[PDB]
């Protein structure tokens, strides 16, 4: 992608068509002639190009109109509408940028944002950029939320977010230019080491990884081609479909063997009836040769009847000897046809125990990416966001992912150690009740015109609730919270004093012994120059490892490394850090997944703002007061940092259009 067309792809927009959101803001254009639409589309793409070519300074309307050319810079109110639209919905002038026009003299409207995560910080940045009084309430003693970086000296290791999932269309590509992010690629070579310490040969590493990807395509065939999506009233999960496909492959292996050995009995039984015909023919030939001999003992001269007897027995014996030769000819073809079938037997098994364990490692890597056991992912909707994956090599933050939320929090009114306990929204305004986390006997009251709630989806699931909503959230909202799934994921940081592994090998895997423990310390990371091994815990093991102390978790870590690198070449780590995101009261899990029985439509339900009832019976329809942003509210980019980043920009533009007015729609 290049030119103004590439800037549209970078902003996740089609360059040749107006989007659904643009139709609501420019209904006079999309309903008008095609010439007006293409003029509008160029102004939109050209404005995005100017912002992306230098996202460290603000792109004013005076700058956009200056760098435009006729006939595109003739309609000025159109350029003003396009620029004000892109600025409002976070497509331009978002993140961290030098402001050309300093902030308004006084602010308009009061907004309380619950949570200082990436989603909350992004919205607070844009809402304050629009000229509103924004205040964030964070329960932790830090910003970032699920973007937590561990630093002790030169040591840096992300306990939360770690990977940037490509830059092609990623808003983080804009943030990586505004913030001193040190992005480094990931070598996708992962040697597998079995439980005995010895490595997996390249023979099985490919013939199992290929069979793994072929099992996933098979589940998609089960879902979209056979409609295998409901099994006895309950929705089918990805784990169910995988076991069904595997059992069908083991079934086909047995069917091939039965029909192969059945070819042998069918042929071996032909040989049985042929040998029985040969043994009966040999007995007739043995008897006929005796009768022919006795007829020849009759010494000449003899009458024509005794002479015909010898000629007759000779012809009859020659005829029987002709049949026996043809049967021995058939015996030769059947006897070597049996050596043909018994030399090409079908596969003995589908997957051996050694193969099935290596396959379980790839299943564990899938349970890591989705942060939940495969028995909970929806077979139909677990890969719904696949079409919106960015392009490019996936990178990591060499200086720590926490540098982004720290830099976004610059210049914002953030109240740390402030746990929100009750959210009250009425027709005339809102009040947020919170306490100080260091001493809960100290209560704070915050009045505002609108509340933006970025509470983690696990916090919204708490029972009894950690945050009380007054009035209660409607059923369609609460039911959508219970339908969605919130996963679990854990890392183990091992800080040594020197490197004892391969510096060229970025990462190596460990193949567990049991299917029930396939995710227990299955992958080890080494990213930076510093001696920090990063062990991964995923799947069903993620929730069980939280109930195990740190010294025991490090014990199982060293037990794996001692068998791989040597019993003496593994020193004791000087610093150990183990995450417990499910036990974290401010997260209650890792991130969201499309659980079975849920769908992508629940992600849009999570974003619909709540509107209170009228204060007086017979009063006009009130204003939406309670808004929801966060990682769990964006349908096409869930469970990611850039998804929460975009979700914050979304509600910030929605709240601004509600309380500041959208003047760009005339």
């Amino acid at each position: 992608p290049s030119g103004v067309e590439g800037a549209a792809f970078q902003s996740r927009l089609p360059h040749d068509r107006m989007t659904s959101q643009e139709a609501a803001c420019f209904p006079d254009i999309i309903s008008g002639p095609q010439q007006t639409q293409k003029v509008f589309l160029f102004i939109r793409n050209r404005t995005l190009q100017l912002w992306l070519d230098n996202p460290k300074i603000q792109l004013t309307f005076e700058a956009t109109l200056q760098q435009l050319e006729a006939p595109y810079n003739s309609d000025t109110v159109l350029v003003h509408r396009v620029h004000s639209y892109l600025e409002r919905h976070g497509l331009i002038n978002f993140g961290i940028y030098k402001r050309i026009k300093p902030l308004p003299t006084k602010k308009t409207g009061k907004v309380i944002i619950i949570g200082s995560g990436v989603s909350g910080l992004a919205a607070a940045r844009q809402l304050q950029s629009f000229g509103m009084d924004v205040t964030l309430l964070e329960a932790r003693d830090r910003v970032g939320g699920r973007v937590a970086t561990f630093r002790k000296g030169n040591y840096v290791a992300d306990l939360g977010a770690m990977v940037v999932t490509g830059l092609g269309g990623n808003p983080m590509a804009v943030v990586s230019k505004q913030v001193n992010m040190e992005l480094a690629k990931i070598k996708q070579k992962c040697p597998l080491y079995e439980a005995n310490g010895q490595a997996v040969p390249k023979e099985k590493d490919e013939m199992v990884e290929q069979e793994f990807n072929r099992l996933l395509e098979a589940t998609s065939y089960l879902s979209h081609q056979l409609d295998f999506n409901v099994l006895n009233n309950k929705p089918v999960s990805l784990g169910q479909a995988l076991e069904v496909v595997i059992q069908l492959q083991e079934k086909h292996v047995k069917d091939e063997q039965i029909e192969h050995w059945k070819k042998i009995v069918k042929t071996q039984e032909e040989l049985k009836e042929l040998l029985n015909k040969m043994v009966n023919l040999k007995e007739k030939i043995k008897e006929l040769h005796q009768q022919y001999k006795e007829a020849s003992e009759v010494k000449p001269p003899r009458d024509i009847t005794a002479e015909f007897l010898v000629k007759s027995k000779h012809r009859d014996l020659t005829a029987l000897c002709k049949e026996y030769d043809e049967l021995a000819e058939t015996q030769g073809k059947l006897e070597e046809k049996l050596q043909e079938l018994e030399a090409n037997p079908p596969s003995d098994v589908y997957l051996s125990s050694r193969d099935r364990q290596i396959l379980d490692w790839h299943f564990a890597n899938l349970e890591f990416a989705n942060a939940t056991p495969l028995s909970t992912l929806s077979l139909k909707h677990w890969d719904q966001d696949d079409d919106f994956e960015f392009t490019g090599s996936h990178l990591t933050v060499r200086n720590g992912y926490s540098c982004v939320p720290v830099a976004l929090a610059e210049g914002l009114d953030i109240k740390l150690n402030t746990a929100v306990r009750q959210v009250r929204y009425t027709a005339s305004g809102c009040e947020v009740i919170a306490v100080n986390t260091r001493s809960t006997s100290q209560t704070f009251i915050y009045k505002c015109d609108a509340v933006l709630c970025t509470l983690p989806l696990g916090v919204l699931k708490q029972q009894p609730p950690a945050v009380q909503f007054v009035p209660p959230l409607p059923e369609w909202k609460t039911s959508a919270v219970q339908r969605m799934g919130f996963g679990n994921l854990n890392k183990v940081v091992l800080c040594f004093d020197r490197v004892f592994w391969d510096p060229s090998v970025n990462l190596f895997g460990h193949v567990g012994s049991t299917t029930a423990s396939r995710g227990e310390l299955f992958l080890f990371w080494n990213l930076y120059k510093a001696p920090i091994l990063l062990a991964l815990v995923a799947g069903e093991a993620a929730g069980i490892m939280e109930n195990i102390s740190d010294d025991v978790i490090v014990g199982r870590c060293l037990a794996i490394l001692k068998g791989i690198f040597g019993s003496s070449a593994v020193p004791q780590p000087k610093e150990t850090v183990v995450s417990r995101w499910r036990a974290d009261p401010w997260a209650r899990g890792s991130y969201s997944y499309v659980a079975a029985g849920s769908s992508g439509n629940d992600y849009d339900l999570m974003a619909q703002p709540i509107t209170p009832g009228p204060s007086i019976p017979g009063a006009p329809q009130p204003i939406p007061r309670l808004f929801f942003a966060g990682e769990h509210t964006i349908r096409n980019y869930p469970a990611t940092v850039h998804g929460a980043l975009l979700s914050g920009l979304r509600e910030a533009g929605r709240i601004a259009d509600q309380f500041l007015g959208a003047m760009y729609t005339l």
Binding site: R214, L215, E217, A218, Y221, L222, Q225, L226, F228, L231, E243, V244, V245, Q247, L248, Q249, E250, K251, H252, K254, D255, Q257, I258, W261, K262, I264, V265, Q268, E269, L271, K272, L275, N276, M278, V279, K282, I285, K286, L288, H289, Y292, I304, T305, E307, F308, K311, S312, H314, R315, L317, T318, A319, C321, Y324, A328
Partner: protein
């Protein structure tokens, strides 16, 4: 449109495994027992054949007669005429057999013999007596 080349996911097989909870193990056991049943049925026929193969030991070599091809003559001698009548009585209309019994008479000559001496040798009676057996 079709499963990945190597997967065998027919609509019929999916429902047979997803019936009940243990329908997967039930199907896979009936194929394991059918594999055992067929496998030991092999070594039963495989032993029956190996036992019959030893009865055919030596072939039929002590029973073959040496090859003797003679000049296909033309004159029907008084001896060869009587050999033909007995061949018709025993073999009927199998001219290839009658030609081999006489030896020095072609198959076309045997068929011409059936018409020339049809009068004096009463071949119609000889043939209808062969049809009794």
């Amino acid at each position: 449109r079709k499963p990945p080349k190597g997967m065998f996911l027919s609509q019929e097989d999916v429902e047979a495994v997803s019936a009940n909870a243990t329908a997967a193990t039930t199907v896979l056991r009936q194929l394991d027992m059918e594999l055992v049943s067929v496998k030991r049925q092999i070594q039963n026929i495989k032993q029956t054949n190996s036992a019959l193969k030893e009865k055919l030991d030596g072939g039929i070599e002590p029973y073959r007669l040496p090859e003797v091809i003679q000049k296909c003559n033309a004159r029907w001698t008084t001896e060869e005429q009587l050999l033909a009548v007995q061949a018709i009585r025993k073999y009927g209309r199998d001219f290839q057999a009658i030609s081999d019994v006489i030896g020095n008479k072609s198959v076309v000559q045997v068929k011409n013999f059936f018409v020339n001496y049809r009068r004096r040798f009463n071949i119609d009676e000889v043939l209808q007596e062969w049809e009794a057996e």
